[PDB]
């Protein structure tokens, strides 16, 4: 191999995050724009995310392959906060480079952005430190979401969204614990719907239907058959299918699954539990069967799902057919086969309210994309509105932050005798490309556009009012409404200037060739 | 085989089926055709005004 | 056939391929030091400070390029740490001896000179050597602490190490009595306290597989006795791979309620056999896992051989491959079980185990790429702190000691020579590359810096050195930059026989000559 | 991944829907000039093509920017009409249009709102040109029949195109808002006759009926039958398989003989003289069905019993088995008739109503084809046509008219935008252009002053390029449905704006 | 030449002299938008006639020569 350092790797550093950062600071933000980008599966995959462009690319470098990841951490952590900690990433890469051929040292510059990066969060925190809950929230939140959900440009009318995530986020991750909990959260919706329908079912929802029409189409509350019990195929880890080949052979095949089942869908509804969920669901002759002892109760359910029913509903576990009885039994507030309005999203909702363990969000969509738009878009929602729950802190967005935390620092800088001023300057002269590169996908100056904020910044002395990160005329972030989670503010800076460090420390390169993935 | 080259056997082979003679007649008024739309783009009329030309003629 | 060459031409090809590898270690090792990236092979990528670790990775083809592998390891075997230091010295004579050579002047007395003073300075080295042992307290927390904040700092952690050196003290002392490092085992999380490490004895547990409810499910155990499993819990439990099938007609129904029995009987197994806490080394099924739950005993899976084994060494116990547990020794227990979550992930802390000499650090870091140094920056503090304690002489760190030394032959430069003060004023001045590495790599003035030691230690001054996190001139000594005289001692056997060895071979035969 | 950039991808973006864009053009406008489809991809043949999708679709799209608009201009067409000569041209309209702009970098953000604005503009500009001919029911007859004009226009049929003029109108008048094939069900089939297609009565299907049976039968209850026969029908003992040896070869093939006659039990339980399936036999189980005196329908017109059974009052389902589950119903008669050299059996006795049946008769099912698909858009946009009765008069001038409401929007509403929403109403003036050509009438002459022509208020006058002349889109009857018309402007628009907001393409 | 936005500001300016605007035109010395009241950037009718007036011919002119011969 080759041991590549120096100017070498340097470049393959800060050559990677700029192809990596551009496609993304094109699409940067609402007016960011759309790009369809296609597999070698050709596959259409139109992506105005970052992140999904992030996950769209894997770009040959170890950084650029990082990078993808990076986000991904804000993007688990905060939704909102995956385009910027990256594109800004590179262009430290710019800034240190430049101070390299400075002659400053790679590890002085280095430590600088970092040294720096104090204000960079710090004075974030000056802004918006509130906290609120959830029935208070919910305005910021929706406000937020204003946003949040505009991000994917779909926020029209789905307030919706933002309120079913206010209520979501609470529930799963506390604003008491303090951590980051999604898990309890069921992801669920389909293809066919409408981004302005869209639900939160706080019990679960099986895709499975009742076997028959002729049996009722409501369980009542509770009683609820939790089992692994086979009334189809069983499939189990490993066994081969063998089938009939006589005429013999054929007819009592019909007479023992006929026999069993009665009996198990008997001794289920002898067990008192008038739905019964199966890890392994009914065939349609077990449905028969099923309308013969006269049991509402659901076909084929995933494995883990069943104790999904067991842990989102409060109901104790049965594990199995053989151990049934009434005392442990799954739990339904109410059990309905829904539509939504489009009979291509139809559920059977098993209903949690008194004792809901897992909350479902149930997102809607006319197309893969549109669900995925509408999900993104939530989802990004979600984890700011999550990070509001729990501390409901914001800024005023778009770089009109950046300018005022490019004063401090860039300020702070010459106050130091230290080399990392210039760092320091850097630093905060690295923060502003955001509204530069957002006034360039909002179409208008770039150059001017930061300064008239900082105009304001003089003026204003704190953002609140900025340039136009809508191309709506109005130039705010206050009024605009950027308005986002000051933690992940926070989150782009420490994420991106420390990976950036991480990778600075790092001019030292065995590699077969220069940027490895 | 070749674009305009599939015509020709097909409109040999009509004349044919359209008559029973003339088989190389179709084609021997073809190449006449084939001509005179070239003046004419030459002179740069249009095709589809050479079109009904066509059936004018 | 067979290979063989000889000759200046194939000894300084020797010389040249010899300070080849040196190029990885002749970077890193510095707070502002490098890290190095080694991505070899399939596109598998290796972030690593350590030389012995990434030069091993690395391609030597040359025997002195195979030399100095063992020479970095030779370091990473005493102290395991110091590597690239000893790697990059003796690259160093050969830049040195790069004129005799091109002069082509080599008495192989030159390299049997080598020795003397790398003897003379050992010598020196544990000459000065000055014990830390009786010279801080009795416990001894304080030269843990002093040589736990000024080893935290040495890489990364100049904040946490006023908050951590403390933790890195006691976890010293605990894990002491038993050399293992993994007992030290630091825990990386974040959405808690980042920055902020606690020092927990019980070890928390990353992987715990718990489902069919939580809350119906035990999470907590004041005498878990503990199952320490190597065994996998399947989904379903089939008889046969063969003579048996599934639906061809009896079977359909027939095998289920029997596949459920090696389940009912194997999953319990291990709770007849005892359990309260069930840790298995692989997955528990999900059906299984609503056993569990519905067996109210706390089941986990996928857990770390590791964590079972500071549990292991922590209950006296031991990891079963059986769902048979036949005695606590084998199986395991603890006085504490409990499940909690410090960052959001589900740990399971066993407290006042049976042992517990091991020391768990419950970590953030200040964010994704940036949270792993802190624990290396931790073992590497709690490595020579227990190094500091594994060497009662602890000289001054930041390379402060070969300055003199090179003076030091800078007399013998002066007084030894017929001749070899050549020897005398090459070899010396390679001591001074090492902590010149540093200035360099962090890109102050090591000339400068060393020399303004100099004029001290024109004054008589040894342990007048580097903080190398300014790369300022200090007392390496006094500022508690440190590492026991031994590994100063360790360094120059190696590095300088290297180039003696590869001196004395100027021919190397290829058997193979393939 | 591959990351195509903000150089190539755009351009490619450019090109490749322009030069998909290119093709159907020319065979659009009035007298345009026809695409020749050239197959030597797949066989080595030439084919003669107006049609969109037939050029669009039987090449397959390659370049990621070629396929959205050949995909969006594709569903245009199945939903409002032919769209996919539209939408694909209109869009790489914009894309020759956004180039200038992108040339000079006009911003991407400022091209999509410009041309979203633009949009409105010529949408609100055709609306302002759109006016209801639908004010009377005989007027929104014509005016049905006018849009279906529109949509009916420029086709290889001949006596289809013109039965179709008051067959959509025919169908969507009585069905009220509507157009289906479920008033009128299509058969298209071959004959001596070559365009024409009549209302059929009943429904006919085309076999003959050969062996003992007659061939035809009177007082016809008719048994509706959604399960039929394979000729060999799974039960519990029809899954005999003896074969080992060559000689168990020779017999089983002859167990079929044994299964194909229980089969006939089935029906002979309901007791009826007619049994219509859905699903068909050979010759031999004929001899057998005719002998027991339940007479085997095959493979009765899925439309065919729902042709009925729209009239009859019958049911339509599925699952059958005995009569119960699915609704019975009658033909005064079912004969069996002579049709060209074709020998058809035929299902008569309800004449018309709700449920219509169209028989297509044609010398190739080329002639077929279009007319099914030409009804297709008629029908839709004279269900437009109903919403709204506005028809704007067609042939250019509801293009030369919007443009120009544009033009003046998008002079002082812009300050900048102008880039785009000018260049929006100049593709709005390219398809009259690419259709100049092809009548060999001058564009520019026409074009600027024939829109200021009428836009400065001839509307009923405007570009016949038939003749190539300003002519009247009135008595020429060019003109369509204000929804057809707006819609086809809604997609390209994005189909040209998409690309655009795509500035790069990762290749995973 | 000032190096400011001529798509804007004309067609501003143009928005402006769309519904017409005989008062402001375009101040490459302030660059914005200015006044002509005679804010003294307005210029006599004597040049920006007569300007308009010789190059009008050329152009055409320039388009009379299709036929050029060159002797040299």
Not at chain 1, 78 to 100: C, F, K, M, P, R
Not at chain 3, 88 to 99: H, S
Not at chain 3, 250 to 276: F, M, P, R, T
Request: hydrophobic share 40%; net charge negative.
């Amino acid at each position: 191999k080759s041991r590549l350092m120096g100017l070498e790797a340097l470049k393959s550093h800060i050559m990677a995050a700029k192809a990596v950062a551009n496609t993304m600071r094109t699409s940067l933000g609402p007016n960011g724009l759309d790009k369809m980008m296609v597999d070698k599966d050709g596959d259409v995959t139109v992506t105005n995310d970052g992140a999904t462009i992030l996950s769209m690319m894997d770009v040959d470098h170890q950084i650029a392959k990082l990078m993808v990841e990076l986000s991904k951490s804000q993007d688990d952590e905060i939704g909102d906060g995956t385009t910027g900690v990256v594109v800004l990433a590179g262009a430290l890469l710019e800034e240190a480079e430049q101070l390299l051929d400075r002659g400053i040292h790679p590890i002085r510059i280095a430590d600088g952005y970092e040294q720096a990066a104090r204000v960079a969060i710090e004075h974030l925190d000056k802004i918006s430190d509130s906290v609120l809950v959830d029935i208070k929230d919910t305005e910021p939140l929706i406000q937020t979401a204003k946003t949040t959900l505009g991000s994917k440009v779909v926020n029209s009318c789905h307030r919706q969204m933002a309120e079913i995530a206010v209520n979501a986020v609470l529930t799963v991750a506390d604003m008491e614990r303090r951590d980051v909990d999604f898990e309890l959260i069921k992801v669920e919706g389909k293809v066919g719907g409408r981004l302005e329908d869209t639900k939160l079912i706080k019990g679960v929802i099986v895709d499975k239907d009742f076997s028959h029409p002729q049996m009722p189409k409501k369980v009542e509350d509770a009683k609820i058959a939790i089992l692994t019990c086979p009334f189809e195929p069983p499939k189990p880890k490993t066994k081969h299918k063998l089938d009939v080949t006589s005429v013999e052979d054929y007819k009592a095949l019909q007479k023992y699954e006929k026999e069993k089942f009665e009996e198990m869908i008997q001794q289920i509804k002898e067990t008192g539990a008038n739905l019964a969920i199966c890890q392994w669901g009914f065939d349609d002759e077990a449905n028969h069967l099923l309308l013969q002892n006269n049991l509402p109760a659901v076909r084929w359910v995933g494995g883990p799902e069943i104790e999904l029913i067991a842990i989102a509903t409060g109901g104790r576990i049965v594990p199995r057919f053989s151990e049934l009885t009434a005392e442990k039994l799954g739990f339904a507030g109410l059990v309905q086969e829904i539509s939504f309005g489009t009979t291509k999203d139809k559920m059977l909702v098993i209903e949690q309210c008194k004792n809901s363990r897992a909350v479902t969000i149930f997102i809607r969509g006319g197309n893969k994309m549109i669900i995925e738009e509408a999900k993104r878009s939530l989802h990004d929602a979600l984890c700011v509105i999550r990070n509001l729950i729990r501390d409901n802190r914001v800024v005023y967005g778009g770089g009109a932050a950046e300018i005022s935390c490019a004063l401090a620092v860039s300020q702070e800088a010459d106050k130091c005798p230290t080399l990392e001023q210039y760092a320091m300057r850097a630093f905060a002269d690295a923060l502003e490309v955001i509204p530069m590169a957002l006034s360039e996908n909002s179409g208008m100056n770039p150059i001017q556009t930061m300064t008239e904020v900082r105009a304001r910044q003089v003026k204003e002395m704190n953002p609140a009012l900025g340039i136009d990160c809508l191309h709506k005329g109005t130039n705010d972030m206050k009024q605009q409404h950027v308005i986002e989670t000051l933690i992940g503010k926070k989150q782009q800076i420490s994420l991106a200037t420390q990976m950036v460090r991480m990778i600075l420390k790092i001019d030292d390169i065995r590699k077969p060739g220069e940027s490895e993935e | 085989l070749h674009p305009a080259a599939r015509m020709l056997v097909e409109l040999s082979k009509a004349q044919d089926i359209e008559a029973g003679d003339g088989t190389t007649s179709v084609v021997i008024i073809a190449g006449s055709l084939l001509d005179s739309c070239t003046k004419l783009l030459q002179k740069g009329i249009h095709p589809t005004i050479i079109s009904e030309s066509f059936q004018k003629a | 056939g067979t290979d063989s060459s000889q000759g200046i031409p194939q000894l300084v090809s020797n010389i040249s391929a010899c300070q080849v590898i040196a190029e990885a270690v002749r970077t890193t090792l510095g707070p502002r030091g490098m890290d190095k990236l080694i991505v070899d092979g399939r596109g598998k990528a290796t972030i690593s400070n350590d030389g012995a670790t990434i030069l091993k990775l690395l391609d030597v083809v040359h025997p002195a390029a195979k030399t100095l592998v063992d020479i970095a390891k030779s370091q990473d075997a005493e102290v395991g740490d110091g590597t690239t230091s000893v790697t990059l010295l003796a690259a160093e004579f050969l830049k040195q001896v790069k004129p005799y050579v091109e002069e082509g002047l080599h008495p192989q007395i030159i390299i049997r000179a080598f020795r003397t003073a790398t003897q003379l300075a050992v010598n020196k080295i544990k000459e000065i050597a000055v014990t830390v042992k009786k010279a801080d307290k009795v416990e001894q927390r304080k030269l843990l602490e002093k040589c736990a904040m000024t080893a935290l700092s040495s890489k990364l952690i100049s904040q946490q190490k006023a908050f951590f050196a403390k933790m890195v003290v006691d976890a010293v002392m605990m894990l002491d009595d038993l050399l293992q490092l993994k007992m030290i085992g630091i825990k990386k999380v974040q959405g808690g306290a980042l920055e902020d490490s606690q020092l927990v004895a019980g070890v928390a547990f990353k992987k715990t597989f718990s489902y069919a409810g939580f809350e119906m499910q035990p999470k907590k155990y004041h005498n878990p006795k503990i199952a320490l499993l190597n065994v996998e819990l399947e989904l379903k439990a089939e008889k046969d791979n063969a003579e048996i099938r599934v639906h061809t007609v009896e079977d359909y129904q027939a095998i289920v309620d029997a596949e459920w029995n090696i389940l009912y009987d194997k999953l319990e197994k291990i709770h007849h056999s005892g359990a309260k806490v069930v840790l298995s080394k692989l997955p528990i099924g999900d059906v299984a896992t609503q056993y569990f739950a519905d067996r109210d005993m706390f089941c986990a899976g996928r857990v770390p051989e590791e964590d079972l084994k500071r549990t292991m060494m922590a209950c006296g116990g031991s990891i079963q491959t059986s769902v048979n547990a036949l005695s606590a020794d084998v199986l395991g227990r603890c006085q504490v079980f409990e499940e909690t979550q410090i960052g959001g992930e589900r740990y399971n802390f066993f407290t006042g185990c049976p042992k517990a000499k091991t020391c768990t650090f419950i970590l953030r870091g200040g964010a994704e790429q940036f949270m792993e140094e802190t624990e290396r920056s931790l073992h590497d503090a709690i490595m020579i702190v227990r190094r500091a304690i594994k060497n009662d002489s602890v000289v001054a760190g930041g390379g402060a000691i070969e300055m003199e030394l090179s003076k030091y032959l800078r007399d013998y430069s002066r007084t030894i020579p017929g001749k070899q003060q050549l020897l005398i004023g090459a070899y010396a001045k390679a001591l001074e590359i090492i902590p010149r590495q540093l200035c360099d790599n962090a890109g102050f003035d090591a000339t400068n810096i060393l020399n303004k030691l100099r004029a001290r230690h024109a004054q008589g001054g040894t342990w007048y050195g580097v903080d190398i996190n300014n790369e300022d001139i200090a007392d390496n000594f006094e500022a508690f930059v440190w590492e026991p005289a031994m590994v100063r001692i360790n360094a120059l056997t190696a590095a300088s026989e290297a180039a003696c060895l590869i001196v004395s071979v100027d021919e190397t035969i290829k058997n193979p000559r393939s | 991944a591959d990351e195509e950039r903000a150089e190539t991808a755009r351009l490619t973006s450019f090109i490749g829907a322009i030069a998909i864009g290119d093709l159907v053009k020319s065979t659009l406008g009035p007298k345009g000039m026809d695409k020749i489809l050239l197959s030597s991809g797949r066989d080595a043949s030439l084919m003669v093509t107006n049609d969109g999708a037939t050029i669009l679709k039987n090449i397959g799209v390659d370049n990621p920017a070629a396929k959205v608009l050949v995909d969006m201009s594709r569903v245009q067409d199945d939903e409002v009409g032919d769209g996919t000569t539209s939408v694909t041209v209109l869009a790489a309209e914009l894309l020759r249009e956004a180039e200038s702009l992108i040339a000079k970098k006009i911003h991407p953000q400022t091209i999509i709102a410009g041309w979203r604005e633009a949009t409105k503009a010529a949408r609100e500009a055709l609306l302002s040109s759109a006016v209801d001919h639908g004010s009377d029911e005989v007027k929104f007859r014509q005016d049905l029949m006018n849009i279906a004009g529109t949509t009916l226009s420029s086709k290889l049929l001949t006596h289809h195109k013109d039965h179709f003029t008051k067959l959509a109108v025919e169908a969507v008048l009585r069905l009220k808002g509507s157009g289906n094939l479920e008033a009128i069900h299509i058969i298209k089939k071959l004959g001596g006759s070559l365009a024409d297609s009549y209302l059929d009565e009943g429904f006919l299907l085309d076999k003959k009926i050969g062996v003992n049976q007659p061939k035809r039968i009177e007082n016809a209850k008719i048994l509706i039958a959604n399960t039929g026969m394979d000729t060999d029908k799974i039960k519990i003992f029809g899954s005999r398989v003896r074969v080992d040896s060559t000689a168990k070869v020779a017999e089983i093939e002859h167990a079929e003989k044994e299964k194909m006659k229980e089969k006939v039990e089935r029906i002979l339980k309901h007791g009826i003289n007619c049994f219509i399936n859905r699903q068909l036999i050979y010759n031999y189980p004929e001899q057998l069905f005719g002998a027991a005196g339940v007479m085997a329908i095959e493979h009765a017109d899925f439309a065919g019993v729902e042709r009925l059974a729209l009239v009859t009052g019958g049911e339509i389902a599925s699952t059958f088995d005995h009569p119960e589950l699915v609704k019975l119903g009658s033909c005064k008669l079912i004969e069996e008739v002579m049709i060209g050299e074709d020998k058809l059996i035929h299902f008569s006795g309800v004449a018309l109503g709700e449920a219509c049946t169209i028989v297509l008769r044609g010398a190739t099912q080329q002639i077929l084809d279009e007319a099914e698909r030409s009804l297709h858009d008629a029908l839709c946009v004279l269900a437009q046509t109903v919403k709204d009765s506005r028809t704007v008069y067609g042939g250019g001038c509801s293009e030369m008219l919007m443009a120009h409401a544009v033009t003046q929007l998008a002079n002082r509403t812009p300050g900048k935008e102008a880039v785009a929403m000018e260049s929006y109403a100049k593709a709005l003036r390219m398809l009259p252009t690419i259709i100049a050509d092809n009548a060999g009438y001058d564009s520019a002459d026409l074009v600027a002053q024939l829109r200021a022509a009428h836009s400065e208020g001839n509307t009923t006058a405007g570009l016949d390029m038939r003749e190539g002349t300003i002519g009247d889109m009135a008595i020429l009857g060019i003109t369509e449905s204000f929804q057809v018309k707006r819609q086809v402007l809604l997609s390209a628009a994005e189909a040209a704006e998409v690309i655009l907001r795509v500035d790069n393409i990762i290749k995973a | 030449n000032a190096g400011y936005d001529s798509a804007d500001l004309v067609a501003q300016l143009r928005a402006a002299h769309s519904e017409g605007n005989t008062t402001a035109g375009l101040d490459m010395r302030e660059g914005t938008i200015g006044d002509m009241a005679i804010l003294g950037i307005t210029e006599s009718f004597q040049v920006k006639r007569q300007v308009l007036l010789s190059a009008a011919e050329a152009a055409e002119v320039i388009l009379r020569v299709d036929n050029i011969i060159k002797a040299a």
